[PDB]
Design a binder for this molecule. Sequence first.
Ligand code: NAD
Ligand code: NAD
Ligand code: NAD
Ligand code: PRO
Ligand code: PRO
Ligand code: PRO
Ligand code: NA
Ligand code: NA
Ligand code: NA
Lengths: 516, 516, 516
Amino acid sequence: MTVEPFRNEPIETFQTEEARRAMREALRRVREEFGRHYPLYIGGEWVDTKERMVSLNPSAPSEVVGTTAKAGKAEAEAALEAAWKAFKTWKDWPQEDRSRLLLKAAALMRRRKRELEATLVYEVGKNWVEASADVAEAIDFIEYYARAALRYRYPAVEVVPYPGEDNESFYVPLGAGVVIAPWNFPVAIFTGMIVGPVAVGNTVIAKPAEDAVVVGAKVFEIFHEAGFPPGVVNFLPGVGEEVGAYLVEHPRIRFINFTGSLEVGLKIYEAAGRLAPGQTWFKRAYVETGGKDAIIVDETADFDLAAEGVVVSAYGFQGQKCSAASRLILTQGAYEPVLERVLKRAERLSVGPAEENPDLGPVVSAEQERKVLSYIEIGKNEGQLVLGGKRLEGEGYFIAPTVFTEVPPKARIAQEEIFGPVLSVIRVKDFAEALEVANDTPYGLTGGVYSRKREHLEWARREFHVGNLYFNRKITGALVGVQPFGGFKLSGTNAKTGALDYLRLFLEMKAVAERF
Amino acid sequence: MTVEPFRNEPIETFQTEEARRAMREALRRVREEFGRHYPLYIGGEWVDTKERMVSLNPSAPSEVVGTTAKAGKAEAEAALEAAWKAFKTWKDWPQEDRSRLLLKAAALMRRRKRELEATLVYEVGKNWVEASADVAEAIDFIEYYARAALRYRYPAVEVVPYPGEDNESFYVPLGAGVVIAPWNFPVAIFTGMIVGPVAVGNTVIAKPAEDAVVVGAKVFEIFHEAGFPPGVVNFLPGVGEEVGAYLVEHPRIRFINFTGSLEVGLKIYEAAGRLAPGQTWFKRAYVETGGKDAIIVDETADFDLAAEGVVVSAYGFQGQKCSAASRLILTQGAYEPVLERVLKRAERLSVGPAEENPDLGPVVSAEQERKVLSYIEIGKNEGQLVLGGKRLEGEGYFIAPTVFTEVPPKARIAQEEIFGPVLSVIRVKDFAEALEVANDTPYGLTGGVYSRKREHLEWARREFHVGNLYFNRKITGALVGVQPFGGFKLSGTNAKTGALDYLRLFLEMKAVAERF
Amino acid sequence: MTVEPFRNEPIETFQTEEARRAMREALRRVREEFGRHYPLYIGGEWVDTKERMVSLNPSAPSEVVGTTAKAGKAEAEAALEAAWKAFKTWKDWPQEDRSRLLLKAAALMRRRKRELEATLVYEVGKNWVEASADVAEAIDFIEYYARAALRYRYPAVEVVPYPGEDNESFYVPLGAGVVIAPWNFPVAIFTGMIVGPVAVGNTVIAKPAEDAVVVGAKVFEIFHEAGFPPGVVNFLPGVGEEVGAYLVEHPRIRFINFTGSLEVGLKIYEAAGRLAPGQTWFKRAYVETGGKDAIIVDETADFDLAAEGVVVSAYGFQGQKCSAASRLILTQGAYEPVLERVLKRAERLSVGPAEENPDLGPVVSAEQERKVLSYIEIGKNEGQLVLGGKRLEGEGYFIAPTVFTEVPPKARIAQEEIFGPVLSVIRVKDFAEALEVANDTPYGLTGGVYSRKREHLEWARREFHVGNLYFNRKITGALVGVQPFGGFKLSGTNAKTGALDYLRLFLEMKAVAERF
Ligand SMILES: NC(=O)c1ccc[n+]([C@@H]2O[C@H](COP(=O)([O-])OP(=O)(O)OC[C@H]3O[C@@H](n4cnc5c(N)ncnc54)[C@H](O)[C@@H]3O)[C@@H](O)[C@H]2O)c1
Ligand SMILES: NC(=O)c1ccc[n+]([C@@H]2O[C@H](COP(=O)([O-])OP(=O)(O)OC[C@H]3O[C@@H](n4cnc5c(N)ncnc54)[C@H](O)[C@@H]3O)[C@@H](O)[C@H]2O)c1
Ligand SMILES: NC(=O)c1ccc[n+]([C@@H]2O[C@H](COP(=O)([O-])OP(=O)(O)OC[C@H]3O[C@@H](n4cnc5c(N)ncnc54)[C@H](O)[C@@H]3O)[C@@H](O)[C@H]2O)c1
Ligand code: PRO
Ligand code: PRO
Ligand code: PRO
Ligand code: NA
Ligand code: NA
Ligand code: NA
């Protein structure tokens, strides 16, 4: 198979009339379908259930954006039988044929990208550019994994020769496993976690987050139209601690690919370590969890650049990103100038229904709102509230861009993942202390430094212990292929998505010798 | 760093009078040194204790080969401080500097190889060639990992460039981890599991098997002479279920590299999945556990070639190998002619003290002996005893080569790892049925087919589900670099030793972007 | 598939007492087996006929080395059905599977090499070293083509990518073809012409030379033991102008791979260009035909080195090589000193039955003998006879080493391939005239220059118009891999044996585009 060198899908800015018109048309088409019901997808067919999942517009939660079927234990069992039955022949597909299937799904997705972005707007309250970058990342994952998979094709392993013998080592896929996905990148991450394992010959049961069941269904419409054989990808919307826990714990689940909270990640990794009755393997579990990400700014930085970058990182998608800057660590000389600039910028951010393309839309659910508001109550005790900190008017879950200052490094709001538009500002003496404070959390996902001092940047390269570090730019929006993505410590297992290494996680190796 | 391309260390066969002379002298000197005491090795110094580990000669268990110090909790804590402290600066060595240190350790081990072989003969009851293969394999691990580590050096990761930015991804070592090793390859596997992680910048606390603590101290004598900095490598002989479990479960242990019984490996892997109080990472655990390894023979095979490889595979080191043929699966037309040839060869095998270079020495301990004899009694009620089945006269732990035939595929002796000189012969109709029976165990480590039929060989290549498969040759003795070693299913986590992939298991990845 | 890098099979010289012992035993056993009957081999089974081919010992033609079955039209038809049917599934084998089958065939031939050399000594009158070179060359073809075939595997072709599309180009084998081989290298060339096409997925009907049918059956014994599927390779000893022509002209024959006389090669190539009734393709035909090969010597040469290489080149296997020096072109200052040295060396050559390991055995048949003696009589009227020119006493076909001097460049004996121990010496003024005379024949196979002058060597490199040119060494004995073998002009189609290019001749290319 020969295709163009990988390039990232362009993220639509909507600066042109044509792009704005195209988005308006998609928003309209999407909302005209708010009444749709999407069944489960099992063994190549849409299969409905008696019970259902309801999906709301977090910008107007009296508005239903759609409903899906609801998978319980029996549907989980049916998905298993279908996935294992498919694995038997899907594993034997030439790699070029599997890679071509992915390339088809990418092209189908690329043709439906405005519709997908409009679904993200309405279903999870992403503004226009956030939605665009989510869909573009999903496309990138498919394009990138299609190509990367060929690097593993029969027989890919470099071995030492031996006289009188052929020694052949090669990779094979593991089997059927479960993908359990978050609501916050419910096209991109949902899509990458599924197609990476599938590309190399594994089969997948995908469990979308409750808050994003509708857009996950539309991803499966693309999978179905691309023509994945029956049982290869299966769609099981349902309750995480029910159907998800059942599959994680199952003796016939071979691997688990998880992105989500640390709380859940810890349970999953623990259950994966256990031999379920009748299980005949050591389960592989990949769990990519949260962060408490910091940006450091020292007195040498471009303060305007820093402030813009901080505001993008802290408040993009209302701070509901594992990559979000939730801590701003400022050296003595950077403290006032950067903080004043951050407050000026952030106080100008608009908040409202996502479809109007505000700076911030709503947080995703009533539960998210309750959790973010509780952390704001905690923070009022721990630091100084200087901006926002309030629910805004309307039914939608609108929360103001929030800033706490004089936050002690060990405060709960300086330690725990709030996952909303809440920035904790920490004042430190110098760069060494800034690094100490950055490293001193259980987490290690993203981090940023604004500085013109080469020695500070190169020092951070070696000692700011996060899996994704950025200098003099935002810390969010890791691009497939460019910035392998994944963290250290309690940010997860360092499965680097959008990287050649990712596929190896879903392969095992056989070594066959023939003595002639 | 530029060295000669890797070549495997030649395995001495003691055919030349020169080799015999060298080996006699080495055995004499080791025997003359019986009763010697070896302390722990922690933070670069030999540290003694009040309690001791006693190492007996399984050929004459009245004889004390030597004793070691004994690590409990306090020594585990001292070793942990020493390893983490060492790690801080060891991780920053250039890869070339670390690789040269491995190369120096290999040159030193090679200079001491007759003495280390002699030590294995006396301590674990290896005959001369089995001892020579073990030491040569340990040399090979060091030479191989020294070179393979350079493939991962700063910055090794292939990324997509982005306008206006440098994007640099690179590998870093994990931290301090524990290595827990078996008695059956106490030089090769003990060395490989240590120097792999250490090559790429990790530090290691090493826990040798109770039955092989003396040869483990001698490997540490080599490390100490080579000049590994204080803390990089630590030697903690002790009780597996005491000090070993303590480290496996410790919040400050970063990874666990384990080779041994499935029973223990299940416990380690389960414990590794738990977050111990105060732990700040997801533990990595590699467990390579046993097998129930079969050789298939069909009627097209060279029956003399088969009989010979079966005997070598079944009985080499007394069947005490994770790779040993413990099942012989014979199609109907192969049954009589192969079984006859196997019985004729096996009844001529000599059994006696290892220093005499017999075909078989003793099993390793009174507990191994008890267990093997017990399985023999079980086997007597499951299949037909046609050879051996007896303890031999003498104080050493000598068990005659044993064959059961007409064994049911689901018999305990056809399913459970006996780890002794006990072969179970299974009669099947055809190659298709041969393959079903071969695959139908909890394990997936090694396998073999003797056949001249290309379609049967190529069928097995695709469907004989073992990590290490061999055609028309023995199924033991996988060579570093040539045959990446590791299994499927409950034979472990498929960490492939002596392959480039192995070292990636002890690294994590950082992605650092600078926007200019 | 990973094997050791290619190395040429060492050519036995029988200097060691061990080699002499092995060769004496092998000759004794072949001699003891005289009169054995070998059937055809078709669709994987040995198939006898009523008629037979008789194979005589040219050293004692009263002795029947053996007999074979004889293929006419019906057997050609059965072989065609078998080859096309085999082709349907053989073309779909992974390249690695087909290459391993070649490797197994090479290991088997190597194990039988003394017996095959012994068979050549008796059947075609090779002395021991000539027989050893022939078998070693056949081993080399298999080893070489097994590896070279992997360079062409799915999808091998380098193409330009295109937006929105996968473009995949790859090679497929042609079909079933006929191989028609000479008697003079009945192991090497017979094997190479067969296993080349077969390696990459073609099937072959093989027609050995009448004088070498016994050693051809023995090569087929090797194929059959190796396990080539029924139909992939078929053995049809028979009359070239009967069954050979029948296949060349058949509408269902896809390609023809031919080595032999120019006269036959002209007919084959002419017939291949015709569309037989109902034929659905343009036939491919490779014809490698004879030479009139010269060595040039100038006055700068080492005259002893030259005399020695000339004698080896002219007289090795009785001058019965397409590569043999049949012309010695001497500049004026080289004329006397080289001719004297050549005459002195050649008059010491021993001639006798091949089993005695003489310098020269007999020519291959009564017809070869008639033809060579007839050319000798022609030569007597064209140049000056200065050595030999006689039949020797005895029943075997023994002809003395023969030299003619002052031969006109346009003499029949200086133009036409005699294929016997007959050297024509031509006297020229200078290196320029040496080159004109060298180029002025219908042929362009092998050539040689002895000279120390760099400008003459480098001039010849550019302008001595032969496919295989050699400086300061013999011009026979081209090694697989080292010296791609094949000529220019009426020495054939320049299908270069033992080179990567050879296999491309038996493949065609498909280009498949998917627009996503
Ligand atoms: N490391 C990363 O790449 C990264 C990226 C995106 C999001 N995240 C993290 O995801 C979280 C936000 O996503 P979320 O709120 O959907 O997280 P979540 O943990 O609550 O849920 C994630 C998924 O797991 C399911 N789940 C919940 N309980 C389960 C159980 N006990 N067993 C099996 N499945 C269960 C949910 O139904 C959902 O599908 C944040 O913590 C964020 O940091 C991390
Ligand atoms: N897969 C492989 O590469 C491979 C190779 C060699 C041996 N083995 C396996 O090794 C086994 C024989 O070796 P063994 O008898 O030493 O195995 P074992 O499991 O009894 O012990 C292995 C090591 O673990 C330690 N140990 C025992 N209990 C422990 C605990 N609960 N926690 C931590 N450590 C503990 C022991 O002290 C020893 O050092 C066989 O099953 C064999 O197949 C596997
Ligand atoms: N260029 C080379 O690589 C090379 C190598 C070795 C031999 N040769 C040539 O081989 C010749 C000697 O070999 P030979 O005497 O076996 O040659 P030949 O032409 O008489 O026969 C070669 C093969 O063709 C068959 N044959 C004869 N007539 C045929 C017909 N019309 N149609 C189909 N097949 C026919 C024969 O049975 C034999 O199998 C010499 O000229 C020599 O130079 C060339
Ligand atoms: O970096 C980001 O913001 C997104 C989410 C994880 C992968 N890429
Ligand atoms: O294959 C074998 O027999 C040994 C065991 C570990 C790897 N080498
Ligand atoms: O060069 C030679 O003498 C032989 C003839 C074919 C190729 N090898
Ligand atoms: Na929703
Ligand atoms: Na011992
Ligand atoms: Na003959």
